[PDB]
Amino acid sequence: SFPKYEPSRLASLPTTLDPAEYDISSETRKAQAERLAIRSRLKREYQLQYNDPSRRGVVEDPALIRWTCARSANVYPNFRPNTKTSLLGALFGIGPLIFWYYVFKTDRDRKEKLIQEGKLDRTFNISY
Amino acid sequence: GAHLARRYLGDASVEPEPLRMPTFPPDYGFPERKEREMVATQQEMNDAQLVLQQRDYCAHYLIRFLKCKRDSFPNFLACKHEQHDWDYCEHLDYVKRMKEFERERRLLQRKKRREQREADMA
Amino acid sequence: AFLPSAAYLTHQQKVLQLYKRALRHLESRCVHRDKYRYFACLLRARFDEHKNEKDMVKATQLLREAEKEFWHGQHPQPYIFPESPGGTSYERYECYKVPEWCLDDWHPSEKAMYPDYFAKREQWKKLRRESWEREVKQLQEETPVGGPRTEALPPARKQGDLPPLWWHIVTRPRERP
Amino acid sequence: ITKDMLPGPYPKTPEERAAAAKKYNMRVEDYEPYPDDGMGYGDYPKLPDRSQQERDPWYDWDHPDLRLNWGEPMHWDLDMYIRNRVDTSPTPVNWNLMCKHLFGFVAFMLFMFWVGETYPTYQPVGPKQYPYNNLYLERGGDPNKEPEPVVHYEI
Amino acid sequence: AHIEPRYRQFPQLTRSQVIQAEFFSATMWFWILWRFWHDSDAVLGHFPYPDPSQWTDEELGIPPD
Amino acid sequence: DAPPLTLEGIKDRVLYVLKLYDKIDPEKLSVNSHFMKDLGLDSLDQVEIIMAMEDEFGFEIPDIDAEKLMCPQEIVDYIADKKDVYE
Amino acid sequence: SGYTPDEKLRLQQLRELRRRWLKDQELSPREPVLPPRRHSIFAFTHVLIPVWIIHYYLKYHVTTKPYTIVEKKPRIFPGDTILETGEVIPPMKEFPDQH
Amino acid sequence: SKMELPDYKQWKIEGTPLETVQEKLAARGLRDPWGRNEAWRYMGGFANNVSFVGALLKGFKWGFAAFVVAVGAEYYLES
Amino acid sequence: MLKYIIPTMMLMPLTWLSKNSMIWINTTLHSLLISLTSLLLLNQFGDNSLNFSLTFFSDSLSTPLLILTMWLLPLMLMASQHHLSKENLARKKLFISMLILLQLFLIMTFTATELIFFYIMFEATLVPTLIIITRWGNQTERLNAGLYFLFYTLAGSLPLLVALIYIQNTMGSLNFLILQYWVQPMPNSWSNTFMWLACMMAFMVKMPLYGLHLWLPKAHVEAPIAGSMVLAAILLKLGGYGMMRITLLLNPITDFMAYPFIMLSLWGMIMTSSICLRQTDLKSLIAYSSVSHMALVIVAILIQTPWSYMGATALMIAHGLTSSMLFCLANSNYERVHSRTMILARGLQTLLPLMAAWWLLASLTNLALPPSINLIGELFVVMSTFSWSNITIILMGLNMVITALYSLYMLITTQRGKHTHHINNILPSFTRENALMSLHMLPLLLLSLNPKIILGPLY
């Protein structure tokens, strides 16, 4: 019949085709009620300190500061050197360096060999 | 465009390729064949600054057309006779080229016929 | 599943949203109006055939099968109104929507060109700062403990006062400034 | 801002997980941190990994352009999943179908162009003939050296 | 004056725009007909195409063997 | 381009497109006529009415506001709010 | 079910406040209070003066330096006359006419 | 500032293809309740529209007449 | 060179005896006078350099750096007078004295003909910079940034002192002209290998090189605005100048000994550029852009061709100007919104149009738009590296994408889109900030008209 749609990393499943949307259990209702309560609390705080006529400045957001501190200043204390991190660091740190060193060394060795034997065309080459 | 199908779907022993031509001497089958003669000397056609592609065997009407185009300014639409002469001469040269192609094709056909006749006879 | 008024979407709401998007996509596939009318009446009949269904699990199964039908039968590029999201001129004029507090930073030389407008602005700011404490004191005494359970806001209860948190929804910029 | 609001180490005991979920303004059963593989993520939550185009375009957000709310725990790659950048929104047809169709079309066109290059199309004419030894002097040939005289005969 | 916006009916048209539109369409068709009458060769062909099958073997210099 | 709108104009527009409905008697409805209460309509008919509103005024009403407009005056108020009429 | 009456009251109050604000957005006739403050000269200032200036520049500062302005030499045909020395170029060979 | 609308009773679906589709729906046991809404589309100046061939040869008559007088003038002025 | 050192050292009585309200006016006026005086160093000859005495000289490489330094000091004085407006008077005078001492040390570092004098003041430039960073920096991490910067520099540069004393004991002199006429080739040995490493690693750290650049995204962020100007516009170029001076003596070992380091930049300027695509911080974005540009300078110096040298000179001057302007714009945004994160303040073209124009022009000069001298330097380095090897053009071309891919990105999220609703303290642009932007930018566009004065000593 119809081809079933499967999710991907760059193409998620649609909301309407998700079975978990149609689950009408009371635990899901409690979860959505708690989520709505949290959202209403945060929205009420934001628009209480946002509609203030006295305030002039920036309504600072703890989530933004939390995100910046996690992205920049919290990476090192939560790092432990194991096999995965060491293999990823060695694979992506000194891999391309060795690869490009070998490529450029090979090309320049071939070019110098051709130049010193009078084979490469260097007729009008006077700007280097 | 049947020659392409003849060479590609049939056999290429008879159909002449356009890469190198001719594969035969011009004195073969043509007693006293005379060569094409230019009307334009190389000096006057050099001073006319013709394109090297346009420096072909029929540059005389090209020079006449360019002189008409230079002399009839700004009346830019009344040099049709000279360009008609020029592309008529180019049409005649194209006719000569396809005649040479047909001559090469018929000579290759004769080669195939002669070689099969000599293979069957002996 | 993400609404400011309700925590969730009921079955009837899902069916109505499906009918809306299916009719819009059918209008996209059926550009000529009479053909669209034929197939829109056909879709209305198909939706009315299973209207009086009392078994909830059968209605849910029909809803899921209709969702699969719709997803198989989408237009790859449906018609979007120019100002709706995804449209050709959606959020086009948002560069022109200057907030009104920039008028507080105007020089007195250019403030002298509009005397009556700035007098009205001053009286509006006076009204806002007169009603703000009444609005917040209404907000504390209306909502139950533990924070509000819904994002909905109360109106102006008493007389002579304004609804709470009204300034940024009244003084919002126009669509085409 | 106070020191207990910043992210900390990876939570293991359930009470630290509860305090972390309280810190990030989310339910305790909805808070799933990144796996403890020592990549520096810490206790930051693992969000459902969806772009900002997937959010509701009609619900009024605190940041209407970003489609985001004040105080919401934002994604670890929010700077990656903004509406100006890579989108994860569902497609009318499948991802593998798109990849297979595009790769097949490109491969078929490349193979057919190779076939056409191997088998060209021409006209049944002889080669173009130029006078004066194929324009030997006009082609940059030196006048001091005498070339082989070639000539074209009429047909 | 300006053109008032009508509702569910055919809008008001100036005589100038329809006159100019008909004039330019007639000019295009006159140009096409005039250029096909005079040139008549850039569409149909310029010179006859001699098919190679009617050329004799004497003018091609084919030796009989 | 873009002639200005007015409240009585948009009210005339919504009423004018409302009397062209074969499920509605034009001699009964008013500007406070409920659909499933005073006119005996259906929810799907309300959806069709809202789509007619969108196709009439050229802008799409969102669903979460389409499920709330129940009288012609409510549609007038919503269009007035969305288009910033009577400046 | 549409609005609650509570929401209807809120929407009505916000709508009348918004209409008052939009009415206040209008302009009085005195606003803005602005303070108090040759037929074809475009063909003179924008055309002729640049022609004068850069003709002076080209004639007395560019062409005085070598190889600044190099022009392709004029085309030479069989049958015309040269101004610089006066030779008549000889005419071309007789055409073996095709027509 | 002031806008005036035509009569709402003047839109009828008779003669238009909306009548045809309403009759087809009746033959299938259905009805179209929105035909009068777009009965204006097929009635008035928006009815009797040209086809592709009619739109391609727009102004062909005057152009052919101009070609005729032009070729006659070019015939006479040569001799 | 005494005509510039003495007024610079007399600027300290000028700033220490002035009134409490006219220190900025007097200091800016007299530093602008010194910047005007600086133009007398353009007396350059096609064969010989300009030699003043036994102690000081200035060829065509040091001259643009000197003019840039003495032009840059008034710009720092105008920039750093808003976050120090509430400061105590004595600390204000101490800050101005630190800036004056830093300029004096720099302009006599660029002119020392003898190498150990160059080293002495090249390290005397550490103290005022570090004092400024660790004193007038804002947040907690200024102390760690200062420690990282100081220790990277000194731990890289003590073997440079050892090698220079070895050169003085071996060759017999450290004068640059004598060394120009007494230079001997360096043969192949391990001693010469570590000689090359000791001579190069100090400038490798101060360039910075990729893998030794970890002190840049701290010291460029925690420092104040004037500290950011000197950190991005002189000191990196000071390391480049020292590299150009000291690569004379290290031939022909360099022809293979530069083989790893080039790769460490050729890949490095990719990776750091990619970091600018995923940076949540504006100042860090500018710092990593500086890392990428200076890595390109490193490659140009290491391949040692004439075209690469002129490209390196033009690139150093243009990058100093552009990085200083970008730091000024970021500091203005930080002053207005009181946070450094890039995503907080959006849509500022609707509120600040002329500063948006300055942002657009600075971003255009950042991504090497022709005919600016940024493009001239980048182009010349590209020609020289293509002469060095072919596949290098790939490592150039991809960079030519990614640079724009962050620059316009930096243009969008700070200036385009819908503005942040709750931020309502966006004051209109002052005349001081606009004057600072114009004084940063107009010399660059004017240098695009006559670039031959910044194309190095072998132009």
Ligand SMILES: *C(=O)CCCCCCCCCCCCC
């Ligand atoms: C053989 O047919 C020689 C002509 C060149 C190859 C075939 C080209 C076919 C397509 C062009 C002609 C189309 C006629 C409707």
